């Protein structure tokens, strides 16, 4: 009879009722925010007061056990809510305590998409018809205020696509301070005020109409297919004819805020788990290489692991704690054999991690030095091309890009592994010798198969073999069926009885794989003991049998011709089974069958990438060429001289619409840049594709620095 | 009979046990370098291997339960001891399992010192003369190594106290390059194995004292005065000539290693929670402080919690995690009635928490915003006299300083509590205007009271008064014996048989104080329902009474003279206990029985540095004169120009041995910097102190930002 973090109305449950709303708080810092603003006083006569409006919360809420939850139960019951009955009519709503309930949630992906959307769900599957009559609201907080230098009154906008139509028409947007607020608690106090002098202009009720019914239950309470497909199309954002008629009567549709909220929340949630398959990293990684750049830019020196990730959370919007951005600093870092990364961003200093343990066995981060790969990284991902890569914006600041386009494609080149459960992934490493011939045959006009291959990117052919690499691993690849097998290596010593484990399979720890035979009853009845005298990077287990155990060992195994007796009683064998998910630039779910099929669907970008290097290239040189000429006969800065992330037609209207020995020296440049330019205009007219000359030269760089960082252990020293 | 993280030896417990070591390491990552370094192989012929030594892991271990340990059970069951044994014979000790033990822990204060604490005092505990007989071994790493550009052999030193001394007598460390190694973790691939190539030169026995029998019993199984008292007089580093026979013998004492490795973590435990009376904030606290001055230098601009978290452990050297740095961070800029700063350091923009959970609803570091408080910093902290301070150095590298010494002590202007337990410390706020008396009147000369205060500082007499601050408390505050409690404030409607709660304790939150009264089963029995309506910032509870219950109330509780029956029915009162625990400035801890003797023992901290502050000022001064009048003539530098954290006699000797309409400004600069020095020597010279003058100064200028900031809400807008 007693709900925990509410406060009931003055006129709730009374005669008032129906003029009484329930403000259904997310969380703490909600309802504070909340009780700020409902206790004004006198400063806000017109405003709310807890006379015909209480407060809920919705903390934790993370058919059986639905109506299980304690938060759920509460609403119910201060709500007056009943199960079996139908609010079909007035009179069976007047018996409510409450007229209304107004969601006041964040409008963050962990707020409105997956709070409002379970409460939406949840009322939906109960009583349909309450949605429909409009007892189900949510406070639309403004989401981004606009303030002028010396104007006290800012700009709100409640949508993103808003402010971009603003923006875009501005003259100049120099003067103008632009804050986001994509939660409750980002609001100062005297924002507060302002919001509750208008609270009944900022109530939007919810709508159910008829496409709503089918995405309920696509995305609530349906895993099948149905939510699949509607996850491998990207988030579409509301278009301006549907946000005016949203602000003209303010009537939000279920169906709309499923398709953008609710869908943005679950492919965030797949995003940081599924990599993308241009770079075959996640978003959180992603911030790691492209702070690794920023902290790294020339800075040859060592830096703490959590020094490091401070940076990165400083500058690249990193907000998911230190505990999962230092673990996956780490597994950057790490070079072992069995390790994720055969190509590691960083130069592993201190003890990383080791094979035995999996790379659980990292030193803290207080002792443990990051080095960027320098060498590796400015070929493998050129810092030339990386201002046309499309970046994401958090809060209005420029972070990591939306996806790397590389030389050539780590998602095919590395053991890419998804933890925990929901849309498994695993990615088993091609070696770097078929991943050459096959770009290089795609990129080489002279290359005998370079036409074929172009046929079969039509037809898949797959002309080109792709096989599992083999690098740091002393054991044997068996193709078998469609799948491939990994072989370890044993020894047996007869006079001894001793079976020594020379290597383990392809992505076994040895500490794992240890236990795991330890726990198997049938296996100790032949053993005795186990002991792991395995170094650094190699493998040597000593299993002493029991003395007449060796002959037995071979007759209950039965000699598989696939798989030996005794990688048989040792468990020396393992599937490499790819789970090939990967999440597209352009938001969504893309299931690859094969492996050239990422390879093929990578290569338009990385081609497109090269024309739009040298599209921009020949642009900018034309303009300084210009400004060259223009002040040697003399004898806009600032954007020719110092190009940024600008388009080819954000470059040339910027450029006019601007302000404005050592002359010796002003002619020598002048003809270096128009060869440059004579360069770029014999370049971009090649017959495979634009660029495609520069394209083979930098294979030839990251060839090179991958042979060098593979002749040491990854440590270019 | 199996333990686990143990891997025998080839010769353990067989004939050749007596040549046999046990390596204990502290970790994971400890057996990781271990494993690496008993396994050169050929690599290292005359370094130890798997023969004759052995691994086991001292993880976790966090009489009756002492035994109970399973790790410590693990150690003794490997090791062949029994209990009830006596090893004071060579045959006895010879059917042990492992020649001796080895502890490979890491040399920072979370591993020798605790690990190596607890070990050495187990074996002391039981088996005695195994520490005696040199059964107790330790692996002593290298911790510093100098590289030298264009040398391969660094130099290594074992204690920082041989590097300082190294240091002093080197004449130029810009070719050097220092690295710290506080764990094991921290040690290359190339430098484990040259510890290795000489793995007996680094093995240190343990020799058992006298004056160890006494220590160990105060460190370990004492929580007696008896370790307080040796906790109050800070950490005495070990001397060349103590370091020195440790090298020529590799035996270390054991009450050395208890005074210096164990003491320091235990200071360090209590330096976490404890702060200096000199600034009243942690260690934790301090880099915040000193990374918020440098973070918002001029960057008037706001930043998220977590941004401005990630460049505190970036530049401040925090290494204790995020979780802890955000919850601290969103602490120094709460502000609001009963919160632990009074003077925020920060400025609170959007919802940082309230009185009604204690802080405990502030909203998500990834949505709030910080920014500092300049204009009260500037003045409490000033950035002139920052310079004068020591600092602490983390690995070689500058970090926050060892102490603040601000114009007024925050240690009891501040109200500071302690949470979880050990160390009690409750520090209530004393009032801006006694404290602004005390302080005048010990500077001022021309003040009244300047004569009889300092007679009153050797004798204790303590004219002047302090009382509680009430600033932000509607209520009162009664001293009653030797204690202070303060009431709060109840409203009676009579007709409406309501009792209305206006105003709380100092300190109580309004969630924790409704949740107390209502688990109280007698006072249930008198109200039915209990109503939060109070606002932000303000109380306003209704109790609702049993129709025939409020008479029965002051007939229960007897209306006590000291508290009312109101007062007692409803717990509307609270002692203000003080805890006055400080940690001193140079290492150790400080009890004072009044808040009195904090400030008296605060002031000549401030008065000598102000003196401190002057000299260097003069000195520098003397020297751009000579500087700007040496150019004149003519018509070092970038120490002279740009002086940094030099003492004025390190100053004055690096100045000396150095390299080498306009002009009328360079004349008038010095006539500046002259009329400057007059001044200087005209202060340094006043009858109470030197530099009492500017003091004074500081003090207004201290005064009118609070006054400002209490104007405001703490926004200063």
């Known amino acids: 009879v007693d709900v925990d973090k509410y406060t009931r109305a003055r006129n709730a449950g009374g005669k008032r009722a129906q003029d009484c709303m329930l403000l259904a708080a997310e969380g703490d810092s909600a309802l504070s925010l909340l009780r700020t603003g409902l206790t004004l006083g006198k400063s806000n006569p017109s405003g709310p007061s807890f006379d015909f409006c209480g407060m809920i919360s919705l903390g934790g809420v993370i058919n059986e056990q639905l109506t299980n939850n304690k938060v759920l139960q509460g609403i119910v019951q201060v709500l007056g809510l009943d199960f079996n009955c139908h609010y079909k009519t007035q009179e069976e709503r007047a018996k409510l305590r409450y007229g209304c309930i107004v969601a006041c949630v964040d409008q963050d992906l962990d707020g409105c998409g997956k709070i409002l959307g379970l409460l939406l769900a949840y009322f939906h599957l109960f009583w349909p018809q309450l949605i429909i009559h409009g007892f189900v609201k949510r406070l639309l907080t403004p989401l981004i205020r606009v303030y002028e230098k010396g104007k006290t009154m800012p700009v709100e906008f409640y949508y993103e696509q808003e402010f971009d139509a603003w923006a875009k028409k501005q003259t100049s947007l120099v003067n103008h301070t632009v804050k986001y607020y994509k939660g409750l608690a980002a609001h100062d106090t005297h924002e507060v005020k302002s919001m509750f002098k208008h609270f009944d202009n900022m109530v939007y009720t919810f709508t159910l109409d008829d496409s709503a019914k ?195 494609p780590l998602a095919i080149m590395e053991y890419g592994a998804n933890p925990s459960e929901g849309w498994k992934y695993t990615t088993w490493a091609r070696q770097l010798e078929d991943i050459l011939a096959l770009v290089r045959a795609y990129v080489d006009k002279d290359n005998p198969k370079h036409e074929l291959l172009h046929y079969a990117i039509k037809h898949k052919i797959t002309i080109l073999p792709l096989r599992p690499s083999n690098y740091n691993f002393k054991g044997h690849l068996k193709r078998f069926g469609q799948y491939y097998y990994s072989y370890g290596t044993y020894d047996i010593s007869e006079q001894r009885n001793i079976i020594t484990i020379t290597e383990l399979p392809l992505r076994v720890p040895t500490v794992a794989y240890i236990e795991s035979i330890k726990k198997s009853s049938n296996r100790m009845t032949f053993i005795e003991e186990i002991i792991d005298y395995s170094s650094s990077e190699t493998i040597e287990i000593l299993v002493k049998l029991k003395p007449n155990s060796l002959n037995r060992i071979v007759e209950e195994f039965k000699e598989t011709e696939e798989q030996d007796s005794i990688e048989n009683f040792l468990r020396l064998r393992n599937c490499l089974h790819s789970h090939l998910n990967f999440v597209k630039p352009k938001g969504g779910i893309i299931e690859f069958n094969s492996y050239y099929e990422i390879l093929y669907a990578w290569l338009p970008y990385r081609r497109e990438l090269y024309q739009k290097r040298l599209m921009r290239e020949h642009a900018v040189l034309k303009l300084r060429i210009i400004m060259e000429t223009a002040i040697v006969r003399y004898i806009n800065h600032t954007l020719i001289i110092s190009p940024e992330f600008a388009s080819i037609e954000e470059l040339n209207q910027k450029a006019l619409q601007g302000c404005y020995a050592a002359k010796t020296r002003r002619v020598e440049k002048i003809k270096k840049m128009q060869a440059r330019l004579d360069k770029v205009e014999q370049l971009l007219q090649e017959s495979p594709f634009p660029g495609a000359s520069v394209w083979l030269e930098e294979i030839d760089a990251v060839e090179k620095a991958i042979i060098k960082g593979r002749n040491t252990q990854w440590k270019f020293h």
């Open 214 to 408: 089918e995405l309920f239950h696509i995305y609530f309470g349906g895993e099948s297919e149905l939510r699949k497909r509607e996850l491998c199309t990207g988030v579409v954002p509301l278009t301006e004819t549907q946000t005016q008629s949203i602000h003209s009567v303010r009537r939000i549709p279920c169906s709309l805020h499923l398709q953008v909220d609710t869908k943005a929340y679950k492919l965030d949630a797949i995003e940081r788990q599924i990599p993308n398959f241009l770079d075959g990293m996640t978003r959180a990684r992603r911030k790691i290489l492209a702070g690794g750049v920023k902290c790294f830019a020339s800075n040859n020196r060592e830096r703490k692991v959590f020094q490091f990730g401070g940076y990165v959370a400083d500058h690249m919007f990193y907000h998911h704690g230190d505990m999962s951005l230092n673990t996956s600093i780490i597994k950057a870092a790490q070079y072992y054999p069995g390790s994720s990364h055969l190509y590691p961003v960083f130069i592993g200093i201190g003890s990383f991690g080791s094979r035995h343990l999996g790379g659980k066995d990292a030193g803290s981060p207080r002792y443990i030095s990051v080095q960027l790969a320098s060498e590796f990284i400015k070929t493998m991902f050129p810092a030339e091309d990386s201002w046309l890569l499309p970046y994401v914006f958090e809060d209005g600041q420029r972070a990591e890009p939306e996806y790397y386009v590389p030389v050539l």
